[PDB]
């Protein structure tokens, strides 16, 4: 049942993987469930080389030298649910060969040289779920080929050369939950580029060339997760997220944000993770109601001097807080947000700290106060903080080191303080 | 496609009718249904040919109904059906007549039911059958004759039943069987030839049984890879125990009242990577591991063993985790030879000191537990050389002072319960 080079398993899978083979091995069982041809030298495929396998559900050609594929090279697989073509030499989408894989739920064309997509690509695949186009030479989003995929739940166009996303490019994919555009060249988004996708919960625009805020996302009522980081965006309007009330996670960092509406982050009750970094010119804080449910907050690279009392009355969910690398000169009491396990205050201008500031925080393992100006610390401040394995006081102006308990902590960094008494 | 009201139908012909409290098969279900999930409904019984109008039905899930008995003609339609799950029902007996003609069936779940009896014609034609779940039932014997009807079976669970005796040649006709689960039975006796015929068997589970003797029957198992006999009554592991199973990789013996282990018992296994022995109260000596050099995890606990053989770390270069806790060990031979060690558990022994060279050289070693010993002295520089050490447990020993060298980068260093004089001051 199993020809020499391959190996055949319990469930009817046959691994010809990594055999240095130029052609489909002959002698394989016709009851083969799965076939793995990955990592071989197969340069080309002949007519119907898979026709003798009627039951074959999964076909892995990943990582071969395959350049072109005869239109009929797969005919006999109407039961095929998954086809992995990744890491091969394809300069184009094998449109004709994909005619009549009518059962196909997974198509990986990612990591090829693909420049062009023939207009009729993916015409019959009505069952397709996952389409991987990424890591290719794609110059534009293939509107026609994607109009044939009403079942698609997930798509990656990432790591291509795309510069612009036309209006209604995704218009026919209503089942789509996940759209990945990251690491393209995109400079321009049509106002209607995202129209039609009312099920999309996840959008990746990261590592692109964007400049305006992408208000196209107003077409996305189901949006949960949004990345726009590493772009050129200069402005986050108030009204930015108004039409996306379900957002849990926003990644905005690595943009030259010169401006952020104070209220841009208002009224997001599902928002658990908010990351803002390296916004150089942005001078100030968020309004942040009705967002009380925030889990992790990162705000760094700015001018803010301080934080409101309401902050820890209203956020009872907050676990990690990264305020580092700001201009902050002062600190409110943190007792309120009881869920705090991590607080990073380092590289600010803060001068002093009191007792109750860190009072009643049970779960806090990590506190980084390092690289500040702090000239003194009250003796009873850290008495209350357990779980604490890491306290970084290093690189301040302080002349005397507090306790306790600093006893039993795994790390206490006191380095770089001008401690006059110890020098003696 | 015509999906009826309780159901949710997909694009491939699946129909999920589960959890809607149905007492009979829904009408209006497509004739092209490939998969039908009827699980978690209230169906008590089902009539003849209920599935007759599903010519293409591949999978049928009846699990989690009240199902009591079934009309011998209820499954008549289905020659395409490859998977059938009846588990979690009231079946008092294996429905042998209902299963006649299911010629495509690869998976049969009769598990989690009340079955007392398996008729002799049971599974008569299922020559495509792969997985058979008879576990969690009332069976008092292994169904020899039904099982002879299953030349293709790769996996069998008789587990969680009342079987007390396995006669010779019981499994004799399953020559495709790779996996045999007998765990949680009452088995006190195994006929010498009870495993004859299973030459493809890679895994045997005898755990949680009544065995007084080592199971010499495994001599029928040339391809055995994994063997559990844990939680039995075996007091002794004989010489040549595994001499017919040279391919063994994993053996689990723990929770047996072992007083003695043969000198050649664990010898000559070149494929053995995992050996677990725990709670052998009267074993006084480290087993002889001559010829077994490829050990990866070794666990030897609960014994009177007072020392470790000098040859040990000379021979095991693959050893990664070593659990020696809960013995009588009073002195440590050098672990230096065991170069792959990432984890060492010595807690709850008699140990007194650790010297400079005990642990010297183990560059991969993250976890060291020396707690609950007698240790009064640790050479300074003893944990020098351990670049990977993240966990050091020195607690509940006699140390008056502690070494600091090599000890700063640790995520966890536990000193509790030692008598440190300087720090009481
Ligand atoms: C271990 O077994 C070998 C081979 O039987 C033998 O040479 C050696 O003495 C044994 N070690 C003991 C009995 O401690
Ligand atoms: C202990 O062993 C280390 C590593 O081999 C060595 O550098 C050190 O000098 C030894 N110390 C003593 C006192 O033998």
UniProtKB/Swiss-Prot annotation, chain A:
Cellular component terms (Gene Ontology): plasma membrane
Side of membrane Extracellular, spans: 1-424
GO molecular function terms attached to this record: identical protein binding; protein-hormone receptor activity; transmembrane signaling receptor activity
Residues carrying covalently attached carbohydrate according to the record: 172, 267, 287, 355
Protein location: Cell membrane
LRR-type repeats, residues: 28-52, 54-76, 77-100, 102-124, 126-148, 149-172, 174-196, 197-220, 221-243, 245-267, 291-314, 316-336, 337-360, 361-384, 386-408
Disulfide bridge positions per record: 2-8, 6-16, 312-337
UniProt keyword list: Biological rhythms, Cell membrane, Developmental protein, Differentiation, Disulfide bond, G-protein coupled receptor, Glycoprotein, Leucine-rich repeat, Membrane, Receptor, Repeat, Signal, Transducer, Transmembrane, Transmembrane helix, Wnt signaling pathway
LRRNT domain location: 1-30
Keyword Transmembrane helix: yes
One of the protein's GO biological processes: bone remodeling
Domain of life the protein comes from: Eukaryota
Annotated family: Belongs to the G-protein coupled receptor 1 family.
Function of the protein: Receptor for R-spondins that potentiates the canonical Wnt signaling pathway and is involved in the formation of various organs. Upon binding to R-spondins (RSPO1, RSPO2, RSPO3 or RSPO4), associates with phosphorylated LRP6 and frizzled receptors that are activated by extracellular Wnt receptors, triggering the canonical Wnt signaling pathway to increase expression of target genes. In contrast to classical G-protein coupled receptors, does not activate heterotrimeric G-proteins to transduce the signal.
Protein name: Leucine-rich repeat-containing G-protein coupled receptor 4
Species for this entry: Xenopus tropicalis
Gene name per UniProt: lgr4
Shown residues in whole-protein numbering: 30 to 453 of 955
